[PDB]
Design a protein that fits this description.
Two copies of one chain form a homodimer. Chain A is of the alpha+beta class. Chain A is built from six helices and eleven strands. The longest helix of chain A has 19 residues. The first copy, chain A, starts with a helix and ends with a strand. Chains A and B meet through helix 1, helix 2 and helix 5 of A and helix 1, helix 2 and helix 5 of B. Bound molecules: the ligand Fc1cccc(F)c1-c1nc2ncsc2cc1Cl (2 copies).
């Protein structure tokens, strides 16, 4: 397709990773005169999509194989973990590599390295854990041996980890914060613009909501260094959400999104912050 | 710079208009599987900012001349008018031409043509009125003959109009909608994410707030064909917005944005809709 030809990317030599670069646009930058986390997350999704496209997945339910489509099987995000050392500026060229390895029998892990292409310096990295689910029962699966063959051709056989260090913050359990929470943002409702292709509430919306929970004093004086998010439930368009946070100039916060009425958990998270 | 070498864009020969093309990315497409209005608005900003950059304007300012810098002056939208005939799909390429001509001495008019990249068929167009504003006082300004000298070199001598037709919808005055209004979206609040470099509410957010007021039946069964938005008074980060609309297979809405507390008008608008 024309987009594959023109895009600033391509499969890498071994064909087991994808690389694409993006010119940071003027509207992508926030109060810190640099790319918002939302922007970064979007680009993580874009390169993930384009990787899938380039190995022959026919953009249906994302990353679904020919058999998965037939057996009504999909990939759902259990965890996202983003770490940014340095937010890029308007007009910077950011290179992002992404690839996918097996994650035992439960599902799949997608990683990302984020470079400033000019310097070649790593400005961020990211890792994510996904699980196979029957889209009809919404119930988890041992990854069929049929499916594994279809996708593992396009994955490195031996570990490639964006986070290869020992007790990696990326795999740390997140506990439920104790109510009442130090900070809260109450009665949040998805806006229309927050809804994706398939009418699900966008990952960037969950990110936004986590930040809404943070005290003005911290965002005025600090920048987000890491975010971790575990997803339990999809938030419906008319659902009403309370976003909570507590602590646990370099600070961490525990997060928790629940439904205002039910009290039911939508997600929980952790965010680390650096001083400006 | 590397960004300009990699952008699908360039000044035209004459140095009086700028053209840049875009691949519609995965997260830029809404429920209709086509680019959102928020993406198209964003793209119109980007191509305008890159035209500024291309004739030697610096960063930290959209088209703010050497003097404007010194006086702490910026450009703000008085009126936006967009028309889309066809929304590009995920993966499609659109070319946008943009240029800027003078609007008496109250300010400047920026216009856009949107074409399909391959064919060069017109799928959309836009025009806008901008006025100078002190970025600190947030107060509108007499356009200096000093600043006119600095920019007028890069504006075509004789009118170029994206809307060359006679009694153009783009120039028609917008009446006050009669309250109480058919449709409403109350207690809207700027998100942290809506705030730009300088800490004020993005142009695109006001468009979103207008679409929030339209009934679900319409968005489910129709596409936005045109929008006219007047910006009368700014939304502050701490302000709360009520967004109103009424009617007046092609349907129109009169719009009105006011502050929940004051009852102060910030914006008034028209939207024209086509059936999917
Ligand atoms: F898109 C892919 C191209 C090549 C190899 C892969 F493993 C994938 C893939 N990426 C995923 N990302 C999140 S779940 C998921 C599942 C798969 Cl099969
Ligand atoms: F960017 C520009 C490049 C070239 C010529 C111009 F006149 C501009 C310009 N464009 C604007 N667009 C909205 S306000 C505004 C003001 C100016 Cl001075």
């Amino acid at each position: 397709t024309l987009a594959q030809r023109l895009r600033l990317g391509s499969l890498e030599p071994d064909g087991l990773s994808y690389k694409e670069s993006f010119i940071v646009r003027s509207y992508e930058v926030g109060v810190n005169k640099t790319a918002t986390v939302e922007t970064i997350a979007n680009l993580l999704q874009e390169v993930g999509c384009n990787h899938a496209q380039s190995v022959g997945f026919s953009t249906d339910g994302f990353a679904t194989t020919t058999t998965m489509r037939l057996l009504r099987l999909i990939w759902v995000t259990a965890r996202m973990h983003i770490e940014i050392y340095k937010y890029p500026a308007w007009g910077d060229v950011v290179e992002i590599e992404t690839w996918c390895q097996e994650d035992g029998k439960i599902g799949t892990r997608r990683d990302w390295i984020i470079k400033d292409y000019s310097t070649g310096v790593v400005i961020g990295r990211a890792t994510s854990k996904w699980v196979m689910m029957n889209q009809d029962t919404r119930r988890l699966q041992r990854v069929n041996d049929e499916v594994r063959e279809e996708y593992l051709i396009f994955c490195p056989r031996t570990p490639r980890l964006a986070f290869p260090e020992e007790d990696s913050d990326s795999l740390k359990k997140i506990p439920k914060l104790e109510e009442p929470a130090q900070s809260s943002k109450l009665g949040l409702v998805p806006r229309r613009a927050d809804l994706d292709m398939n009418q699900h509430v966008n990952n960037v919306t969950y990110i936004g909501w986590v930040l809404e929970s943070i005290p003005q004093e911290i965002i005025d004086t600090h920048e987000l260094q890491t975010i971790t998010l575990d997803y339990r439930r999809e938030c419906q368009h008319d659902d009403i959400v309370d976003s909570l946070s507590s602590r646990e100039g370099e600070c961490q916060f525990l997060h928790f999104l629940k439904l205002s009425g039910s009290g039911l958990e939508i997600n929980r998270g952790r965010t680390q912050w650096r001083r400006l």
